[PDB]
Amino acid sequence: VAIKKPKKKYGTDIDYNEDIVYEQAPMPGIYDTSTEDRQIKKKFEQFERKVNRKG
Amino acid sequence: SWRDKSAKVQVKESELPSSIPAQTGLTFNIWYNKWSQGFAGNTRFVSPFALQPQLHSGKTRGDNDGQLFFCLFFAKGMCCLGPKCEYLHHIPDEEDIGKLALRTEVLDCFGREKFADYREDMGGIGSFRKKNKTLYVGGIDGALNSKHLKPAQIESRIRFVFSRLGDIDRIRYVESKNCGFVKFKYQANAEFAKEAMSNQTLLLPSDKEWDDRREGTGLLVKWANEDPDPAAQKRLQEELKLESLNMMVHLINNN
Amino acid sequence: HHIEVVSKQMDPLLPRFVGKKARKVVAPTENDEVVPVLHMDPNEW
Amino acid sequence: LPTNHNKTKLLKSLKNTKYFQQTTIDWVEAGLQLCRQGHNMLNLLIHRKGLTYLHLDYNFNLKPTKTLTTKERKKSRLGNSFHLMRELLKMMKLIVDTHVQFRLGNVDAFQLADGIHYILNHIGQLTGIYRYKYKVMHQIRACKDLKHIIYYKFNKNLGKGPGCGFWQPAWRVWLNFLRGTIPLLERYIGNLITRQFEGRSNEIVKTTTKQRLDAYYDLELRNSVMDDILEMMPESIRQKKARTILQHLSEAWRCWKANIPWDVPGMP
Amino acid sequence: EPPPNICEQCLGDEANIRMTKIPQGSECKICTLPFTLYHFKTSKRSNNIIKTLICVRCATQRNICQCCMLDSRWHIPIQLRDHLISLVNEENVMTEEAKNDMMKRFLSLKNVKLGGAQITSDPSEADNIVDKLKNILLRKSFFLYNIDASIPEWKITDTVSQLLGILSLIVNHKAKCGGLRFQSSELGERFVSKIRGVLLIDRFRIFIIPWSSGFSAASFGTNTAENIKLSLSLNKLIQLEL
RNA sequence: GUUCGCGAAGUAACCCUUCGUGGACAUUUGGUCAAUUUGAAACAAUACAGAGAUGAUCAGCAGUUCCCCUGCAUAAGGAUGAACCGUUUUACAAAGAGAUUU
RNA sequence: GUAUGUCUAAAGUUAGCUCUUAUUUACUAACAAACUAG
C-alpha cells in the first residue's frame, strides 16, 4: 500500500513529484549538450537504484 | 450471427428506472442531479441491466446511416429504442474498429471524449496518450455478494464474461489482490467491455443468490496501469518495437 | 481544402464563451536572446 | 433623450435566432408559465451554488429548511440582485394568481379589480421589494399617493370601504419602475451568472477608499523612501538591509510624533 | 489569431468543406485553456461531427493536428513518433506531458516545440530522418504446450479459425499452457484432418493434445505458484520431447 | 401534390374521366450536447479544538500569494478572509605569527 | 459561546545529591450559585 497524497486544498493545486515544478530549461547556448545529460541521467538512475536498496 | 437480424428493444421506456438516484441525503439537488446534507451509504449499486450479446445484437439505423460509433446503453444493456438507436447495437468486431482507425485515439468507441490523463481513480473514459488495452477488474467481493469461491472458478467466470465482448489478448486474475487484468486485441474492445461490465455481477443464474442479485455493489472495471514486472515490460517493449517497425515500413512507403 | 469558415448563431441565453473560465495562469518569461546589461564606470554608509 | 441609433431591441434580437419561436397563447397561460419558469430559474440559481436547504417556496418565499451554520449563512446570503428577482416574481405571481382566482370562477371581476388594486398599492406590504432596492419606495410612495387620490374620487358618495379597483396609474408606476430596472437587473444578473459559470475575475484590485488612505499612503511613502535610499547608496545589492533602513524612517516618524529629536548615531 | 492545424485525413476526401468557428469554444484537452474551436462534418451528410480538441499552441508544440491528434507531417501517434526518433538518434526523445494544472498552462504558453516536434517540423530534417529510417530497415477439447508469454489468446483463436473455415478457448499465460473447446462433433474431426501435431503461428511452435478431460482453468492450476512450477516442468517435458 | 404542353383509351363523343409522357413550382435540417455510478460541485454527518500583537480582552486597515468565497460591484464582508512565523554556510579575501612534508 | 480549522476503507492495480509527600502562589474553564461574543 502506497502513501496518501495530501488533499488538493484548491482546485488547481500543484503536486511537485509528477512533473518538473516549472520547466525552465536554460536558453540554448553554442556548446554541445547531450554528452553530459547522458552522464546526469546515468548517475541519477544509479541514485534511484541506490535509494531502492539503501535510501 | 448479428449482420442478419435487427436489434431488439432491450427495455421499454416505462421499464427504465428513474434518473433520480437512490436517496443518499435529505433533499435533491436538481442542478447536479445529486443528493446533499449527508453522505452515508453507497451511491454505487449493482446495475439492473446486463448486455446479453447474442440475443440482443442486430442491425440498427446506425448501419443505415453509416455511423460507426457504438451504443453506450447497448453495452449497459438499457436502450429503449432498440432498432432505431443512432449508434451500433452489436459487439465491436475487427472491421468496425478498422473503420474506427481515424478517430479511436481521439474519441473512444462510444463518441465520448478522451481526456489528458486518467483520473485519480483510474476509471472513466481514458487517455489519448496511452494506447490502453488492459482493464483492471476489481470489486469482485460484492460482485459475488461476498461468496467464498476458489480463484480458478472466478478467473473462469471473468474469462467467460469478457469473451462475450470481443477478442482477448490476456486475462490474469490476481489471487493475492482479488483483481483481474483483462487485456484485449483492440482498444475499442477494452472501451466496450469497460462500459459493458460496469457494475454488473459475476453471479450465475445457476446459484441460489440469483434473487438477491442486486443487493451489494457490483464489479469495478477500470483502466489499468502498466504491468510492472519486467517480463511484461519486456513483451510490451518488443511488441511496441514490432508495431513501430510496421510503422517504419508505412512511413517509408508514404515518403 | 479551400474552406469557408462560418461562425454559427450561438444561443443567446447560453454562456457565449463556455470555454471562458476564471483561472490563474503563470506565464513563462522566456528569453529568446540574452540581453546585455551594461554598467560601464565604503565606511560612510 | 433616447438614443437615436438604437436599432437593436431585446426581443427583436431574439426573433432572429433559431431558438425562440413565435406563438399565440392566453395571457393567463403566459403568466403561469413565467411563474413556473421563474421558479425553475431561481431554484437552479440556488441549487448550482449548493444552497439545497433554502426551500424557495412556490410563492417565491426563500425560507431555510433548517437552522443554519455560519458557513451555511455565508453561502446562503445573496445580494440585491437575486432577491430583487425574487421580489419581482412575488409581485408578478400575485398578479397572475389573482387573475387565476378570477379565471377559476372563484372570485368576481370586481373583486379581481380590487384585488389587483390592492396588489399594486401594497407591494411594500405583500412582497418585500423595499428591502433589497430602496428607491422602490419612490414608486411605493407614488402608489400610496395614487391610492390617496383615487380613494377620494372613487368614494365621494360612498364613504369608506373596499371595492375600488381603478388600478391603472399605479400599474403605470410599476411598469415605469420595470422600465428603469430592466437594464439594472440585466447588468446585476449578468455579473452574477458570469460569476456562477465563468467565475470571479482573479485580478480584483482594490481602489483606495477612506479605509485605505493610511495603509496605501504608507506603502506610497515607504516605496518612495526606499527608492530614494537605493538611488543614494553606492553599489549595495539589496537582500536584507533594504527592509531595515525604512525602520529608521518609521522610528523617525514615531520620533516626530513624540517630538523626540531623532538622533541615531552613525547614520550618514 | 493563428489558423488551425487540421491535416488531410480529418477533413477527408472533399475539396469544399464548411467548418464552424466558435471563439473561445472549450478548454483544450492538454492545457485546459480556452481557444477558438472549429467543428465540422467530413461530408455534407456525415453523421459524425468532428471538432478540434486542442488549441493551436498545443498543436504546434507537438507538431500535431487538432482533430485526429496525430502528427502533421506523418499522421502517426506522438508516443510512437517519439519512439521512432529514439530509434534513430540513439537519444530518448520523449514528450514531457504535464499532470498539474498550473504546469499544463505553463507548459503550453511557452514558445518551444517540445518532444519530437522539431524533427518533423521542417521537411529537410524530416526527409533526413526518413532516409535514416531506410538505413535502419536496411540493417471435444484440446490442450496446448509451448506457449511463450508473447503469444496472445486472439492469435491462437485466429490461426485455428484460419486453418478451418469460419469454439471458445482458455489459455493460462502464467502457466504458459493453452486449451480449446467447442461443441460440434464434426469440428473436432475436421481439426484432426487439418493438422501431437504442431501449430505454427509465427514460427513459434505450439504442440497439440487431444484432451479427453473436460478442462477448466483449475486444470491449468489453482494458484500462481502452481503456474510457474508447471510451466518449468512442462518446458522440461518439451526438452524431453527434444 | 398543383399547374402548363402532348399522346393513348373509354370513344367514329372538341363533354368528362383514366393511363402514359416532357417541363415548371418545391431542394440537403439537427448536434461543442447520448438516458443514474466510472470525467470529478460543495455543504452537511463524527470527533476535537475554538482567533493577530502579549500578562489578559480586543477594533482594525494593509502587503505577498501559482488560496479563494459571498457580493451587482472598482464598495463592503468573509477571524485583521485563510497560508505568512519554517529552515538559515561560498559574489570569502588580505596581512602577520608559529608547528609540519621536501 | 462563536468564527474558523483539523481527523474519518465502499471500491484491494499484476514481481551537595536521587526520592515520597503536603501547604502556598500564578494562569485557565459557556464548570455552579436561562441570558451575554470578536
Ligand SMILES: O=P(O)(O)O[C@H]1[C@H](OP(=O)(O)O)[C@@H](OP(=O)(O)O)[C@H](OP(=O)(O)O)[C@@H](OP(=O)(O)O)[C@H]1OP(=O)(O)O
Ligand atoms: O389609516 P388611515 O389614515 O385612516 O388611512 C387608511 C389607510 O390608508 P393609508 O395607507 O394612507 O394609511 C388604508 O390603507 P392600508 O391600511 O390598507 O395600508 C386604506 O385602506 P385600503 O388600502 O385597504 O383601501 C383606507 O382607505 P379606505 O378604508 O377608505 O378604503 C384609508 O382610510 P382613509 O380613506 O380614511 O384615508
Ligand SMILES: [Mg+2]
Ligand atoms: Mg472581529
Ligand SMILES: [Zn+2]
Ligand atoms: Zn442504442
Ligand SMILES: [Zn+2]
Ligand atoms: Zn492547450
Ligand SMILES: [Zn+2]
Ligand atoms: Zn488529423
